[PDB]
Structures are given as structure tokens and as C-alpha cells.
């Protein structure tokens with residue numbers, strides 16, 4: 001079945017030394033390492049198939065245009081969209097959410113309306129809605145957290161009303177690892193006539209995602225967290241909404257100095273300038289690589305690795321964990337009264353890469369009354385030995401610093 | 403001493419066959435091929451140095467952050483900016499111009515003002531200004547063309563008045579190869595208190611560019627036309643202007659659900675989300691590669707190649723050329739009454755890649771009373787033998803089709 005030894009052999013960076021020690025990279029939630037299959041797919045495109053892709057007549061350009069559109073089709077099958085034309089290539093999740101907030105938001109949210117977010121959102125799924133509610137005179141409502149890191153689902157009937165136009169909600173928390181009950185939340189939102197955008201940047205690498213089963217109206221994720229290149233992400237929009245969305249800024253179609261400007265049809269309408277064809281080719285290879293391993297195989301390995309880490313972390317004195325027992329992907333923690341950045345600095349000195357800080361989720365930190373947390377990511381190429389290095393390191397820090 | 407043979411050996415795509423014949427890639431103005439040094443720099447980053455850059459403290463993240471900031475410094479020296487912090491990493495020229503129009507334009511162009519562009523502008527340097535003039539109620543004024551493809555410089559003094567806020571002008575036309583007299587135009591604009599944005603997307607690969615000597619207020623170009631990766635470009639803004647530009651839509655600094663949002667300072671203010679670190683590393687390698695060849699050496703070789711091409715094209719019956727005698731980089735043409743797309747399709751049969759259509763410059767096409775043109779690019783890796791194949795192919799099409 002799944003062999004972590006064979007998976008690790010695909011990732012050249014895992015041989016790196018840091019501070020003279022073999023790297024234990026526990027920060028895939030910030031960005032994932034890339035297998036050779038992804039790196040080489042992008043390089044081979046540049047070495048042998050590169051051209052511009054904007055309606056070029058010559059053979060190299062026509063073949064490159066086909067490669068790009070085949071990646072759009074592969075991505076649409078990956079999330080089980082009904083049509084490839086429901087997918088927009090964006091620069092990343094941040095840009096995809098802002099695109100919805102401006103194109104769809106400015107045309108559908110008006111004075112007196114409200115938008116619902118949650119207290120656990122990444123800043124990228126808060127600020128565009130704060131700005132939009134400021135542009136039009138709408139109200140931003142917030143689903144509160146429970147101490148265990150889940151959302152208070154029972155507050156949703158009170159927060160929704162006939163003026164709620166959109167729920168913007170994370171699939172999986174980037175700090176807590178919480179997987180939100182999207183199917184139930186989407187059912188409730190649609191009864192009030194609201195749309196639902198799902199921030200899926202921390203979900204698509206952990207298990208299969210089916211946007212038709214979810215029935216979400218928008219879904220966004222980032223290529224670089226899905227073992228792929230930087231500078232590329234995917235925005236999915238239901239065709240009925242996407243074909244109605246007005247232009248934002250293969251996007252400009254015609255220009256006249258006397259008659260004005262027209263724009264191309266969606267999804268190309270929202271892909272201005274020159275595509276990041278290199279990143280698109282690499283992203284396609286990342287989807288092929290993940291699919292070849294099998295997302296259910298990945299989910300089982302990662303779930304068993306998480307269970308091992310949580311059981312082992314019970315032997316660390318004065319450790320505080322944040323989030324639910326059934327967390328996906330990440331473990332958020334603090335050690336005693338020590339500053340998160342000090343804990344992170346000692347772990348780095350032991351060759352272990354974790355992330356410390358507010359993790360672009362300051363309202364979440366405020367809820368737990370801390371300035372920062374440490375966060376360890378446990379991805380499909382991580383091992384028991386790396387978990388053991390984390391646990392023994394935390395025990396070592398507690399012994400030395402009290 | 404420039405050797406085209408030594409240069410061509412660095413570009414693996416040039417060994418490609420198209421339609422069974424050795425490739426003659428005459429479309430670098432659409433997008434440039436990349437040397438192995440650029441492809442490998444990006445791949446080596448992914449293989450051995452990859453991490454997130456958003457102020458991560460662990461060793462790999464700190465090192466990746468330093469690599470990105472070293473590229474910003476290298477790019478600032480490449481265009482002779484005063485400070486590396488005058489440069490913003492943008493997705494491309496299209497996005498860079500829109501950034502200026504939305505942050506600077508919305509704060510400096512008001513009802514009753516005017517903006518001046520030219521009739522030869524790329525759509526990306528037209529539409530942002532058309533839409534801004536509609537958001538605020540300003541007038542868009544246009545420098546007309548001459549038959550030889552130069553701008554009517556003598557009309558500028560009457561187009562400028564005390565209400566002119568900005569001149570947006572191309573350094574080198576992407577269709578005609580006209581190099582505009584920026585020194586005179588910038589001197590005139592500044593006498594009226596206007597700022598100047600220069601679209602330099604077709605200039606920076608052909609000769610040295612010095613933004614202090616030009617004294618332009620904004621300068622923008624694209625990485626993929628400068629032998630670099632897709633998905634990355636550069637926006638230069640004078641420091642005094644850049645630090646006054648407000649945010650539009652590391653960019654988010656702090657988020658509070660009760661107190662609102664703050665943003666980072668420029669240039670980072672205008673780099674939202676996750677940087678395209680792969681493309682930045684490759685862009686750095688492209689600047690190194692070009693600087694090692696020498697832009698004055700590149701300019702000399704390309705000018706002699708252009709002179710040879712224009713002399714040889716005189717032997718083609720029914721050939722119409724568009725543009726001035728001292729064109730840079732590109733030759734725009736049509737053959738008899740034949741459709742440009744048909745000419746390009748036949749050349750593609752001979753293994754020759756040219757671009758056809760309106761080249762994102764429909765007002766230019768309308769001036770010449772044609773729907774489209776063919777465009778051959780003559781870059782630093784092109785040769786006399788490729789020119790000869792273009793000439794022979796055009797002669798063949800004229801013989802076959804009339």
C-alpha cells in the first residue's frame with residue numbers, strides 16, 4: 001500500500017542538513033516540499049515545450065495552450081467539478097478569495113446585508129469581507145469558537161437571516177486542524193438564499209474533496225501547499241454564478257479608443273495578463289502525483305501518524321495543545337510559559353522546522369488569550385522518527401528552561 | 403565578444419523540431435525562451451532550499467527569505483534604481499500597471515483631470531486608464547501616430563495642461579519596435595507637474611535601462627520576456643511616491659474583528675499572499691545571465707541582425723512593413739492581401755514561429771487600417787540563417803498563393 005520510504009525518496013529536499021543536523025521539516029502547512037516529478041515536469045516544459053499561450057497560431061504555442069487546458073481539466077476532475085470551465089487559475093488562495101469578494105461581492109452585497117465568517121479564519125478569508133462590508137455598508141458576523149477548537153454550530157441559525165448573502169468558511173483550520181461540518185453549514189446557508197465560499201487551502205492534500213457533494217458555490221486552494229509550485233492556485237465557481245460574474249480589472253478582449261472595452265468569457269475572463277504556465281504545468285504534475293499515491297491512502301497514513309504523535313506528546317510536561325482530538329494535519333501547542341519563538345528557536349537548533357507566531361489567524365489567538373502558538377505539520381512524507389525528535393526536543397527544552 | 407553560437411547552446415528549446423523541421427523561434431516578443439541557467443536555478447531552489455518565506459524563523463525559511471530579498475536588490479541594480487525598496491514584485495506588467503492605476507491613480511486623479519496615453523499602447527497600458535477616467539470623471543487623451551510608426555511628438559505640448567496628472571507611455575512598441583523619445587516626453591510632463599509611467603516590457607532585454615537617468619516615476623516590465631520564468635514581473639516606483647501610495651485590495655499586517663486591519667509598508671505592502679519564490683529565484687538567474695552577456699553586446703548583435711533582416715526582406719514581393727527604420731526587436735509586416743493568420747500558418751509549416759493577430763494593440767491596427775499583422779521577433783539567440791528561412795518562406799507563400 002502506502003510506503004513512506006518510497007514517498008520520501010521522491011523529495012530531494014529531505015536530505016538537507018540544517019544547523020549540521022538532518023532536517024525534520026514539520027512546516028508543510030506553511031508550504032509543502034515538492035517531489036522530483038513536479039520539479040522536473042516544470043523544468044521539462046521550459047526545456048522542450050515553452051511558448052506563449054494566448055491564441056498563438058504556431059505549433060509550440062498551440063501545444064502549450066493545450067497543456068494548460070488539460071491541467072484545468074485534470075484539476076476539475078480532482079475536485080469533481082461538473083465542468084473544466086468552472087475552474088479559474090488564480091495566483092493563490094488569497095487572490096482567489098479577493099476575486100470573489102470584488103467581482104461577485106460588489107454585485108451581490110448591498111447596504112443593510114450581512115456576511116458570515118468564523119473566528120478561526122485565516123486573514124485571507126477575513127480582510128476581503130471586512131473591506132467589502134466597508135465598501136457597501138454591510139455587516140460582518142462571526143461564528144464563535146468552542147474551547148476545543150470547533151465552531152459553535154448552534155449559533156448559525158441566529159446568525160443567518162434573509163439579509164445574509166454569503167458564508168465564508170474554512171474547510172480545515174490552518175492552526176487547529178479542525179475540519180468544519182461543511183455539508184450541514186451549506187444546507188443551512190442555502191435555505192436562507194446565501195452562497196458559501198469554502199477556503200480549502202488546508203484540505204485538498206489530506207483526503208478527497210468533492211465540490212458536487214459539498215454543493216459549495218465557491219471553493220479555493222493553493223498549489224504550493226499541495227506539493228506544487230508557487231504562484232498558482234485554483235478557484236472553483238458554480239457555472240451558474242461564474243457566468244454571471246462581472247469583470248474585475250486573456251481577460252481583455254477588444255479595446256477601442258472611441259467605443260470602450262470588452263472582456264473575454266469566464267473562466268478566462270478572470271485570468272488577466274500572461275498565465276503562469278510554468279506553475280500550471282507543475283501543478284498538473286502535483287495532482288497526478290497525489291492521485292497516483294491515492295488520497296485515501298494518504299489520509300490513512302497521515303491519520304495514523306497523527307495518532308502516534310498525539311499519544312507520544314502526552315509525555316511532555318507542561319504542554320498545552322489547542323484544537324480537537326480528530327485534528328487533520330497540524331498540531332498547535334505552547335510549552336509552559338515559554339515564548340513560542342523561543343521554543344521554535346530551540347527546535348530549529350535541533351534540526352526541526354516548526355512555525356511559531358500568529359499563523360495569519362490573530363482572532364484565533366485572541367480567542368485563546370495567547371499572542372502566538374507553535375505549530376507542527378505532519379504530512380505524508382513525515383515519519384515516526386521525526387515525531388520522536390519533536391517529542392524528545394520538547395522534553396529537552398522543558399528540562400533545560402524549566 | 404558576443405557569440406550567438408555560445409548563447410544558443412544555453413537554450414535547450416532551440417534544438418526542438420516543429421512539424422518535423424528545425425525550429426526557427428521568431429516569437430520572443432510574445433515570450434522569450436529560457437537558458438538552462440534560469441531553468442536550473444528554479445529547480446535547484448525547489449530541490450534543495452525550499453521553504454515558506456513569510457517571516458518564518460527556522461533556518462530554511464530565513465534562508466529563502468534572504469534569497470528573495472537578494473533578487474530584489476539585483477533587480478534594482480539592473481535598472482539602476484536608487485534603492486531596492488523601490489521595487490515591487492508583481493505578477494507581470496499587466497498587474498503592475500493596474501496596481502499603479504488603482505493605488506496611485508484613485509488617490510491622484512480626480513474629476514476634471516486628464517491622463518495621456520499613446521495610440522501605440524498595449525491594451526494593458528490602455529484599459530486601466532480608461533476605467534480610472536470613468537471612476538473619477540477624467541479625460542483620456544491620446545498621442546497620435548505618424549505613418550512611419552513614430553508618435554507625433556509635436557502634439558504633446560497641446561495635450562498637456564495643468565490638469566494632466568499622468569503620462570502612461572511605452573518604452574518600445576510590442577508591434578512596431580519603435581523606441582519612444584522618453585527623455586523629451588518626461589521633461590515635458592514634469593514641467594506640467596504630471597507623473598510618467600513607462601511600460602518597459604519590450605525594452606529591458608534589448609539595451610541598458612537606467613531609471614535615474616530617465617527620471618521616470620513608474621517603470622514596469624515582465625520576467626517572461628526577459629528570458630525568465632512566467633508569473634513574475636517588476637514594478638519600479640520612485641521612493642517618495644511609493645511610500646505615499648495607499649493599499650487597495652506580506653501585505654496584511656494585523657487583523658482584529660473589533661479594530662479592523664493594518665497593512666505592511668511598501669514595497670511589501672503591494673505583495674499580497676505568498677510570493678512566487680520559484681519565479682523570483684529564476685528571475686534573479688535571468689538578470690545574472692543577461693548581465694554576464696552584456697546588454698551593450700546584446701544590443702550590438704541584435705541591431706546588426708535587424709539590419710540584415712530588413713535588407714534581405716527587400717527581396718520579398720508584395721511585402722508591407724510597418725514601423726520606423728530604427729526599429730528594435732520586432733518586424734511587423736503583412737504579405738499582399740493575404741490574411742496574417744494564413745501567412746503565419748504557412749510559416750509554421752516550415753518550422754518558423756511568428757505571431758499574428760492584433761498583438762493586444764487594436765488601436766494601432768485601426769490606425770493602419772488593417773485587422774492584423776504578422777510579427778517576427780529577432781532576439782539575441784536568433785541567427786542570419788533563421789532570417790534567411792523567413793525570407794525564403796515568404797517568397798514561397800507569395801509564389802503559392804499569389
Ligand SMILES: *Cc1c(COP(=O)(O)O)cnc(C)c1O
Nearest residue numbers: 092093094122174201222675676
Ligand atoms: C495558506 C492559507 C491561505 C492563503 O493561501 P496563499 O496561497 O498564501 O494565498 C488561506 N487560507 C488558509 C486556510 C491557508 O492555510
Ligand SMILES: *Cc1c(COP(=O)(O)O)cnc(C)c1O
Nearest residue numbers: 273274494495496524576603624
Ligand atoms: C507583453 C507586454 C505587456 C503585458 O505584459 P504581461 O507580462 O503579459 O502582463 C504590456 N506591454 C507591453 C509593451 C508588452 O510587450
